[PDB]
Scaffold this active site. Structure first.
Site, PDB file in Angstrom:
ATOM      1  N   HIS A   1       0.869  -0.973   0.239  1.00  0.00           N
ATOM      2  CA  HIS A   1       0.061   0.040  -0.127  1.00  0.00           C
ATOM      3  C   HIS A   1       0.661   1.508  -0.207  1.00  0.00           C
ATOM      4  CE1 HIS A   1       0.696   0.688   4.523  1.00  0.00           C
ATOM      5  NE2 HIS A   1       0.598  -1.015   4.646  1.00  0.00           N
TER       6      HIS A   1
ATOM      7  N   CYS B   1       2.303  -3.487   6.544  1.00  0.00           N
ATOM      8  CA  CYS B   1       3.015  -4.150   5.904  1.00  0.00           C
ATOM      9  C   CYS B   1       4.176  -3.724   5.099  1.00  0.00           C
ATOM     10  CB  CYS B   1       2.088  -5.665   5.403  1.00  0.00           C
ATOM     11  SG  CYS B   1       3.116  -6.394   4.276  1.00  0.00           S
TER      12      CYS B   1
END
Length: 278
Positions: free
Chosen positions: A166, A182
């Protein structure tokens, strides 16, 4: 694009060319500014530039941009994420190229795939994080809406077991280990992936701080980064952080024509840039 490389078809793994730039004398920009301009991670910039000041690179100094690299020893398919060098490699179906983008992290060895992708992702904080925020008096919705304040940024690719690749709404972070999230990418980079990565694309995480190759012309190269768990003190030499050569790396570095002084200097320096061994 300096970070889109034609893929060699002869088994070569050395791609790209380094640049060197001069910092204006009147410079006011931190290192992150240069790292963003050249699509590099902050840690990669530090590795390539011993003693550079992250706060304010010294006006009139020179800065190495480490755009030459060895491709990790993996299939040339889908997405490969090598956390030890803060890089994501994408081998598109539609081209015979590889795109190499800098990432920030907060998984070591795992093969998965892109399950879905979303423009304007919502963020669902952990029950943990909410507990912590609520005690601090910080409002935290169970669902943080898409938009400019969303810490996943404006695009996400979901890969299973909760994880995503992301964006970020922050001004730094790519090429750094952080808490939360993440794998994160800068705005234009995450958008590019979102536009170009189909659902179902293979994703593989590796942890390879050292890479080496014997190329088709008989030349041999090593590339050494700091290991994933490296602290500031290990980085600067106040502590040591040990690097062990794997057997695939030794298949190159133990060859009879290798200058072992280059290997040892490479291991000590951890510059992140390929160095010829023979």
């Amino acid at each position: 694009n300096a970070v889109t490389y034609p893929l060699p078809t002869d088994g070569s793994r050395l791609v790209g060319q380094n640049q060197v730039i001069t910092i204006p004398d009147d410079n006011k920009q931190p290192l992150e500014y240069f790292a963003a301009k050249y699509q590099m991670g902050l840690s990669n910039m530090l590795e390539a530039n011993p003693g550079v000041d992250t706060y304010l690179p010294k006006g009139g100094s020179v800065l190495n941009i480490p755009q030459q690299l060895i491709l990790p020893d993996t299939v040339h398919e889908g997405i490969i994420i090598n956390s030890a060098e803060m890089r994501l490699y994408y081998y598109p179906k539609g081209t015979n190229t590889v795109i190499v983008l800098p990432i920030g992290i907060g998984p070591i060895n795992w093969t998965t795939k892109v399950e879905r992708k979303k423009a304007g992702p919502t963020w669902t904080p952990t029950a943990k994080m909410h507990a912590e925020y609520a005690a601090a008096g910080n409002p935290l919705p169970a669902v943080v809406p898409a938009g400019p304040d969303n810490p996943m940024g404006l695009y996400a690719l979901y890969i299973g077991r909760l994880y995503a690749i992301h964006g970020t709404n922050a001004n730094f972070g790519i090429g750094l280990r952080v808490s939360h999230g993440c794998v994160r990418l800068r705005n234009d980079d995450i958008k590019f992936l979102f536009e170009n990565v189909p659902v179902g694309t293979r994703v593989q995480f590796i942890d390879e701080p050292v890479k080496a190759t014997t190329e088709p012309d008989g030349s041999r190269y090593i590339e050494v980064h700091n290991p994933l768990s490296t602290t500031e003190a290990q980085f600067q030499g106040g502590e040591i952080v040990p690097i062990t050569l794997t057997q695939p790396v030794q298949a190159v570095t133990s060859q009879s024509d290798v200058d072992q002084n280059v290997v040892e200097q490479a291991i000590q320096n951890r510059s992140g840039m390929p160095v010829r061994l023979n």
